[PDB]
Design a protein around this ligand. Structure first.
Ligand SMILES: Cc1cccc(NC(=O)[C@@H]2CCCN2)n1
Length: 460
């Protein structure tokens, strides 16, 4: 039975509004409703992995798992296995996988982050799951961010706290946050970003939605504008939105948006918004294709509609050679040539690099670089041809060209990372000097760049 080189992943996000679900929720898992929807001809084909994020979820874990499994079994005639379930307050993540994937799944991790301080601490935050699928690391974050149209900056802060503090994936990747630990990272939830238009324009917005004319609304969506200004979700992707705003509906119909201020809302307006979102970030040159992104039309127990997204995701096999794992394969080498980091920092410490990758027995520390001043103010750290030659565990090009090198640039004085990035080994040529590049981030914000040349030797 061959190992797969691609799987499909379902991501769902639903703010259930503290109400139990209706008896049938299959439309969600079938990607049917509004937006980019799934072909009817695929309805019986199971996804490999289903990841369900809920917010304002009133059910017990047991109650929701029974509904989910019975839903999938009705669609696919497959009894899915539970990979993980984790709940913080009313924020929950469930990961289910086809039983044939049991032997392929390992290193299952869960964690949560509570985002608020005092007043603000006690119901917002995030849950997450990670695991390995054969040679591929997968991370999943369900976040419920701060509500209210005038709190976009709090939402951005909530995002940075979650990616700093959520402890998923390989703890040996100590310089790296979740935005660098996974081949594929999916971040979804009730992100709570709103369409920023005047209150007086509510009925105009409703009209636009009834005409399915979303362009002048999406141009005011706070998540799209904050992303375009590099204030949040730097280096993540989102499919184009082609479904109506998923909040705030009157319950038991989808015919009415309930936007007007009420005591129950804290006297805040809830103009129709795309609160409920799915974003992803995959390592460079790994296959990831969104095959659906939309909302259901027939699940009406909440003031939100469920959102679905599905993905093709490239995966790699576990590799065993005569040599690695458990020795190097001297037929393999990675040389980083004429590299330099450009940093935005005002500090004047010396810096060194660390190279981390599951193609190495353990991470590699470089010598200190040579600091120079850039023409426009910047620190430039030069490494020359001084960098340690990296010795991968397997030299077979079918393995090595699918790997990635994580890079951290660290202060000699503090051993703190000033920037993290990732380089693909999916090169146009081996035994050939080729340009490489990554942006460098720290706490998910841009802090610099790393560029230079690579020379990769494989057994071919
Ligand atoms: C589908 C599923 C759910 C939960 C766990 C797993 N698989 C594993 O944990 C494998 C079994 C042997 C060691 N690792 N698969």
């Amino acid at each position: 039975q061959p190992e797969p080189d691609m799987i499909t992943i379902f991501i769902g996000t639903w703010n259930m509004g503290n109400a139990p679900p209706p008896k049938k929720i299959t439309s969600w898992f079938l990607s049917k409703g509004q937006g980019k929807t799934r072909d009817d001809s695929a309805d019986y084909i199971p996804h490999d992995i289903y990841v369900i994020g809920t917010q304002e979820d009133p059910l017990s874990e047991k109650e929701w798992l029974e509904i989910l499994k019975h839903s999938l079994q009705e669609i696919t005639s497959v009894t899915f296995k539970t990979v993980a379930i984790h709940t913080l307050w009313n924020i929950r993540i469930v990961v289910l996988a086809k039983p044939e994937h049991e032997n392929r799944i390992s290193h299952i991790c869960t964690d949560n982050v509570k985002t608020g301080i005092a007043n603000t601490l006690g119901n917002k935050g995030a849950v997450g799951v990670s695991f390995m699928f054969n040679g591929t690391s997968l991370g999943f974050v369900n976040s419920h961010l701060t509500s209210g149209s005038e709190k976009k900056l709090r939402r951005n802060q909530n995002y940075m706290n979650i990616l700093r503090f959520l402890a998923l994936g390989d703890k040996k990747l100590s310089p790296f946050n979740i935005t660098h630990r996974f081949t594929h990272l999916f971040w979804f939830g009730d992100l709570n970003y709103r369409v920023d238009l005047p209150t007086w324009e509510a009925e105009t917005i409703i009209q636009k939605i009834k005409q399915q004319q979303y362009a002048d609304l999406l141009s005011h969506d706070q998540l799209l504008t904050e992303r375009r200004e590099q204030k949040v979700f730097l280096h993540f992707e989102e499919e184009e939105i082609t479904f109506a705003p998923t909040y705030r509906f009157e319950r038991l119909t989808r015919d009415k948006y309930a936007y007007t201020k009420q005591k129950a809302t804290g006297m805040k307006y809830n103009l129709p918004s795309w609160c409920d979102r799915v974003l992803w970030k995959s390592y460079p040159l790994v296959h990831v294709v969104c095959q659906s992104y939309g909302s259901t039309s027939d699940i009406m127990t909440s003031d939100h509609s469920p959102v679905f997204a599905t993905f093709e995701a490239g995966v790699t096999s576990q590799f065993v050679s005569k040599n690695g794992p458990g020795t190097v394969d001297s037929q393999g080498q990675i040389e980083f040539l004429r590299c330099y980091a450009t940093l935005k920092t005002k500090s004047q410490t010396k810096f060194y690099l660390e190279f981390h990758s599951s193609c190495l027995e353990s991470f590699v520390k470089s010598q200190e670089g040579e600091n120079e001043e850039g023409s426009e103010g910047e620190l430039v750290v030069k490494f020359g041809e001084t960098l340690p030659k990296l010795k991968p565990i397997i030299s077979d090009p079918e393995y090595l060209l699918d790997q990635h090198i994580l890079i951290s640039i660290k202060s000699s004085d503090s051993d703190e990372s000033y920037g993290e990035g990732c380089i693909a080994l999916r090169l146009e040529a081996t035994e050939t000097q080729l340009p490489i590049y990554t942006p460098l981030t720290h706490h998910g914000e841009l802090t610099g760049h790393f560029q230079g040349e690579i020379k990769l030797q494989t057994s071919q």
